[PDB]
Write a structure and sequence with these properties.
It is classed as cell adhesion. By secondary structure, the chain is α+β, with helices and mostly antiparallel strands. The protein contains six helices and six strands. The strands form two sheets. Strands 1-6-5 form a three-stranded mixed beta sheet, with no helix packed on it. Strands 2-3-4 form a three-stranded antiparallel beta sheet, with no helix packed on it. Strand 2 and strand 3 form a beta hairpin. The protein is globular, with a radius of gyration of 15 Å.
Length: about 150
């Protein structure tokens, strides 16, 4: 091929390998998405940093680590149904997620954003998918004011 032998790492594995995205994996495993991402195909997932979680409040964070339903929910919205990378965009791109809500991704100033959120290090080639490290845990649409 060109560069092999060393080894690879599936989208999920890529996260499992990276410690920064450890606590996240657990979330996936618990949610029961690992397998899904384990099976070949394509799935755009976003793994935030380590402190990205510590930022989360004990109201949302806990819940996540608590209720799985709500957990997978977030993960679902964090996972896509296609590989979207800053390759041939244009202005805006709508990534059909699993949770149901389409993930918004665009390329401006050469910067990638997901749901109006800054990405850490996008363009993460996997074995059967892609990954885009985020600087903070994404959140699904909802009334957040009260």
């Amino acid at each position: 091929g060109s560069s092999g032998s060393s080894g690879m790492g599936t989208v999920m594995d890529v996260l499992k390998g990276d410690n920064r995205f450890s606590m996240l994996v657990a979330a996936i495993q618990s949610a029961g998405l690992t397998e899904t991402l384990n099976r070949e195909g394509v799935y755009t997932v976003f793994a935030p940093t380590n402190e990205a979680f510590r930022a989360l409040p004990p109201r949302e964070r806990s819940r996540l680590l608590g209720d799985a339903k709500e957990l997978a929910n977030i993960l679902k919205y964090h996972i896509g149904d296609e590989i979207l990378v800053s390759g041939g965009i244009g202005a805006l791109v709508r990534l059909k997620s699993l949770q149901g809500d389409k993930l918004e991704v665009s390329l401006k100033n050469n910067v990638v954003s997901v749901n109006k959120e800054p990405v850490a290090e996008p363009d993460i080639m996997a074995t059967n998918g892609v990954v885009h490290v985020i600087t903070n845990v994404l959140q699904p649409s909802g009334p957040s004011s009260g």
